Subunit: 116 residues, 4 copies
Amino acid sequence: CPLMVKVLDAVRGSPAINVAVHVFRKAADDTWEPFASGKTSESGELHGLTTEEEFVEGIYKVEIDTKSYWKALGISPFHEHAEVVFTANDSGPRRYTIAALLSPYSYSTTAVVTNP
Amino acid sequence: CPLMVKVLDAVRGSPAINVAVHVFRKAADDTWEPFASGKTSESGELHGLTTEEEFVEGIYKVEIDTKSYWKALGISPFHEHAEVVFTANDSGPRRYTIAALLSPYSYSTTAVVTN
Amino acid sequence: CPLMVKVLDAVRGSPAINVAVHVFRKAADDTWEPFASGKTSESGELHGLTTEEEFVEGIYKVEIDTKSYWKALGISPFHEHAEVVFTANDSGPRRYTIAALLSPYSYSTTAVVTN
Amino acid sequence: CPLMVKVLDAVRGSPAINVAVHVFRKAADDTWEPFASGKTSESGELHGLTTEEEFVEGIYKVEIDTKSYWKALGISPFHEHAEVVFTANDSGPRRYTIAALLSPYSYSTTAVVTNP
Ligand SMILES: CC1=C(CC(=O)O)c2cc(F)ccc2/C1=C\c1ccc([S@](C)=O)cc1
Ligand SMILES: CC1=C(CC(=O)O)c2cc(F)ccc2/C1=C\c1ccc([S@](C)=O)cc1
C-alpha cells in the first residue's frame, strides 16, 4: 500500500467516512489520467488505492471529494475538493500517506512520506 | 477587492513573500481559464486580483506555487503547488480571502468570506 | 502593536468575532500572570494588547477562549480553550501575530513574526 | 487505549518521533495534576498513556513537547509546546486521539473522539 489517504472531520472530531478520493497521474501529454479512486472507510482511511507495481514515478493528484462529504452531512462547504498534487517516487518508491483534515471552510493536507 | 489571497509560511513564521498565485475560472467546457495572478507582497498578501465586476459566480481555482516558494528558500517541498478550488456564490457574504499556511509537506487553506 | 492575535473560524469561514483572548506572561515562580486580554474584533483581530515597552522578552501564553466561542454559535466544542505558549525573543523580527484557525474539534495556530 | 497522541512533522513529512507528551488532569483544587506521559514512537504515535480504568472524567491537558522536538532537530521553534485541553468522558468513556501536526512556527491539534 504505497499510497494511503486519511481524512478527518474537524467539526465532528471523527474520521471523515465515505469520502470519495480520486487519484490522477499526469500523463505524457500533460493531462491528468485517472489513476485510482476509492472511498474512505469508517476509520477515515483509504487503503489499497494502488500497488507498488502500479505506483510508478509520476506527478499525482489526489482529489478528495470534500464537497460531497459536507453536502451529505447537510453542510454547504466552501471548497469543491481538497486536491494534493505531488511528484511521487522521484528518488525511488516511497509510501505516501496523504492526511487531510476537513472543516466546512478549510482543509489541510499533510503528507507522510516513508521509505519502505 | 472581492478576492484576496494571503499566504503564510509555517516554517519561518512569516508571510510567504513573492509566492506566485494564479487564479482560474472554470470555463463551460470544464477547463480552467486564467483569470488573475500575482505574487504575494511582503505581507504575504495578494490584492487587486480582480474587481467586483469581473468576479462573477463560478468555480475558481487558486493555484499557489508553493513549490517555487520552497525551492527559493532552499527547502525541499512535497506538493507541486497548493490548489484551492471553490464556488464563488453571490448569495450572502461576498469578499473572499483565501488564506493558506504553507509547510514543506503540508498546506492548509481557509476561506474567510465576509461583507 | 508588538503582539496581535487573529482568529478565524474554519466552520463558518469568517473571522472569529468576540473571542476572548487572555495573554499571560510567565512569572519567575513559573506561574502565569495576566498580562493583557481583549475580544477579537469583527475582523477576528485583537489589537492593542500591549505596547513595545510592556512586551519584554519572556514566555507568553495566549489563551483563546475557543469553547465560549463555539458555545455562542451553538456548536459543540472539543477543547476547553486554545493555548498558545511561546518565547518572545528580542533578537531579530519583533512584531508577533498569533494566528489561530478554529474548528470545533481542531485548532491550528501559527506565528507570524515580522519587522 | 482510551487516549492516544499522534504527532506528524509537516517540515519533514514524517511522523514526529520521540516527542515528549505530558498529560495532566485538572484536580479538585483546580491545579494540573500529572496524569501520564510518554514519547511518540517511530510512527509518531503514543499509545498506552492510560487505561480505561484510569482515564476517568476530567479536564485533561495534553502537552506535546514540540520545543524539544524542534531543538533536537537543530531548529528554533516558536512555540514552547502544543497543549490541548479538553473535558474527557463527560457523556461516558470515549477514545480520544489527539493528532498534532508540527511546523517550526505552527501547530494544529485535532481530536478524534470515538465511542468504543
Ligand atoms: C494566511 C492566514 C491568515 C491571515 C492573517 O494572519 O492575517 C490567518 C489568520 C488566522 F487567524 C488563522 C489562519 C490564517 C492563515 C492561514 C492558515 C492558518 C492555519 C490553517 S489550519 C492549520 O488549516 C490554515 C490556514
Ligand atoms: C488524517 C490525519 C491523521 C491520522 C493519522 O495520520 O494517523 C493525523 C495524525 C497526526 F498526528 C496529525 C495530523 C493528522 C491528520 C490530518 C491533519 C491534521 C491537521 C492538519 S493541520 C490543520 O495543517 C493537517 C492534516
